Ligand binder design. Structure first.
Ligand code: OCA
Lengths: 303, 37, 303, 303, 50
């Protein structure tokens, strides 16, 4: 309910898989193979594997074939035979992957071992992106990973954001629910839970815990500025101090030096900043200067 | 003769060893100036 | 509540990670590889690693691939398996990273060790920045850092801005709350707190402390001038002295030498300076000259 | 309150840090690398450090990369792990740093030792300056400086402006507040305060002192002339003597020789000088000639 | 970072900061406020004698 939205469990993580493949069936919107040699080379490899040997040093210009990179996410506790979703991306001078089909492609880990096999039909949106697609249930798991879940008497809940008050809150909630000495905070990002030994008992424990509800404590005042997209966001802890501001073409609705009153809550901040009558573009510069001076009692992050 | 010991034109040692600089005084400064003549 | 907004804890810091990667799936808005050799070279390295050896000295001109630098922030107390956010930036003659996908990329520290692995889909704003993007939960932590948190009986709260009165205020507040000899100010930027030995007790202590409330004392009068953006900010401690000012095209609304009365509070300052009727552009020069003369009883900082 | 606005403390100072870095992610507004060889050279160094060796003597023309100088201010009592603000400036034939990202950069002192590491996103104002930006909390402190604060029984308050009456006023105020023999004036710019031995007691002392209030004595009559910007400022101590003035195109509102009466206060000065009806441009020449003759009883400074 | 020498060619201050140009006005000249820090001190015989 809530704890499952704040933490993850130690040992339950995702991995990444990558592979190379071919996409066939395009309407003449494939690679110009006279400039992507690996396309024709891998096509010859596949044909030879199937039983057809094309002579070397011959002319070959295709249009319905594209060379693609396939990426996938290996899920936790994955079992062989299950299915996952893959993303297919062009990799040389192709125009579109509109109605293509992905041929048999092995997906390797970082140790260069095959963990899944991918094949299916691509769904391109159809402005939109043409050289990228997604296949639903397009890969099947072939290898499984070992794990030490169920061994021991201790699991670790890892918070998504560091905080001491939050770790203490989660610890106190678990201790209030599941007995006196069930949890212990290690640092601002880990809670060590004692669980019975076994495999089903730990699942019962984690099922009971993951649905508990905790009240989030107030976080740090911060202001996020995304200059690339042109956006500004302020959480509900920002305050202000009375100070004067001047900027090009901005005036009182009075001269060019406008006042800004103190602001305790966020509504007061929004009101006092809207009083200046500035676009977000100028609001970025105003906020940077105010943080440098001392009015802005927040934490400016340029993302 | 060529075996009679003669002294070279450039006498003495033909090399010098760098000396370690003084220990910086612990004021609030990064700029430390060795005793300037 | 407040102390967490003024200080940081010793040993709880962030680090930086950087890596090199490839972005595939672009709509023909990738590098012109005839002038970025490292793109094709690294693509050949990847293909060879996967099992395909492209002959050397061959023609290869791609359009859906771009070479990028990936940057990330290693968080405090990071545990392996968690996720962080990455920033992706083009590095040679690419047009856009609109719908690209980041391939498997290792993120190194300053000691050239792999601390995280990055892979995911890029979100470009879509004027806006095209050659820069951000991936949410795009990297996974692989290595952990050791730390000596929980060892000893002393932590250090490091203020964000140097001040003696502020350090003394924080010390007195902690001593008023958590017993007589709990805190001690070392200098204008550090408060040494005595904590019980252990790991959970220190978390309880820091959870109790970080949410205390202290009243900020008046800071130094200062005026920030950002000439690059064209902005001026004055905190609530600036005062003025009576003096005359003259500048090109400015006149009394009377000759060209205008008076400025004494000003104790900030409202008086804003009024007296708006009386001159000057844009911020001229206000910068007026303020510099006034600070040089002696009217402006503040601290001018050109940022 | 006031003393903190007039003096600094001996041993509490700032230092400067400088470093070289690269900025990536620009929209084709980076260096023209065929004329800035150090850009490509340092990019090759970074790639080689990461694990990719680009052959030498090859073509390489980038557009999304710029070479920059990073400057920062090492604050007093800085502790490792804290954060400071950096300024980023282009250094060869770049067009803009609009949406760039600063890669890992070490900031050296004057002894060529690394004191901070810088990395983050740049905020360019967006006429405005394009080739210069500022990053908030963009650097982290890595090295600390030793200091002898807290050792001894004597600190020095250093005035910001030399004056004997002012040093005597500060000394008398401190002696009136903190006991008979607490302070002693050394010269026009230093006050020697006796403090108890230790580290916390000196902080208590400096916290008590820095918030005291002293009444500033009248300074010297001076007139500041900034000919480059075209501005004139006169503090409240300037007086005048009766004399005649003539200048091109200026006349009585009567011939071309106008009278100027004696003026004791500043209002009389402003009135008598506005009577001549002259722009600041001519006011500069009039004031220079008057100071050369003997009317202007002030101190002319051309800044 | 710039060192400021006296007439005896000794470093007395170190200068670094942002320039404020007026913005007709002078473009090739600027002033930096609190742009230099003192590194060396001069001796003096103030306080000695009557
Ligand atoms: C070198 O050893 C030459 C010395 C010979 C001088 C005397 C010959 C009889």
């Amino acid at each position: 309910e809530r704890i499952r939205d704040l933490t993850s469990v130690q040992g339950v993580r995702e991995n990444s898989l990558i592979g190379y493949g071919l996409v066939v069936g395009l309407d003449g919107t494939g690679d110009q193979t006279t400039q992507t040699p690996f396309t024709t080379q891998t096509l010859n490899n596949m044909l030879s594997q199937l039983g057809i040997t094309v002579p070397t040093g011959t002319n070959m210009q295709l249009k319905n074939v594209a060379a693609v990179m396939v990426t996938a996410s290996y899920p936790p506790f994955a079992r062989q035979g299950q299915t996952i979703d893959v993303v297919v991306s062009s990799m040389g001078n192709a125009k579109s992957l509109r109605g293509g089909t992905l041929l048999m492609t092995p997906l390797k880990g970082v140790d260069s071992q095959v963990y899944a096999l991918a094949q299916g039909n691509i769904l391109v949106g159809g402005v939109n992106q043409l050289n990228g697609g997604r296949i639903t249930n397009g890969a099947i798991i072939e290898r499984e990973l070992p794990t030490q879940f169920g061994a021991g008497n201790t699991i670790n809940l890892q918070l998504n954001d560091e905080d001491f008050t939050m770790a203490q809150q989660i610890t106190d909630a678990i201790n209030r629910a599941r007995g006196y000495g069930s949890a212990t905070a290690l640092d601002a990002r880990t809670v060590q839970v004692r669980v019975p030994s076994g495999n089903s008992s730990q699942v019962r424990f984690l099922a009971d815990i993951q649905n508990m509800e905790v009240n989030v404590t107030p976080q740090d005042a911060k202001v996020v500025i995304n200059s690339r997209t042109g956006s500004v966001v302020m959480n509900r802890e920002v305050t202000l101090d009375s100070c004067a501001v001047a900027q090009g073409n901005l005036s009182v609705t009075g001269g060019s030096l406008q006042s800004v009153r103190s602001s305790a809550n966020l509504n007061s901040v929004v009101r006092a900043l809207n009083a200046l009558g500035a676009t977000p573009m100028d609001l970025m510069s105003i906020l940077q200067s105010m943080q440098s001076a001392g009015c802005l009692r927040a934490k400016l992050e340029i993302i | 003769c060529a075996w009679i010991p003669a002294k070279p034109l450039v006498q003495g040692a033909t090399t010098a060893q760098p000396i370690p600089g003084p220990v910086p005084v612990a004021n609030g400064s990064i700029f430390q100036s060795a005793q300037p003549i």
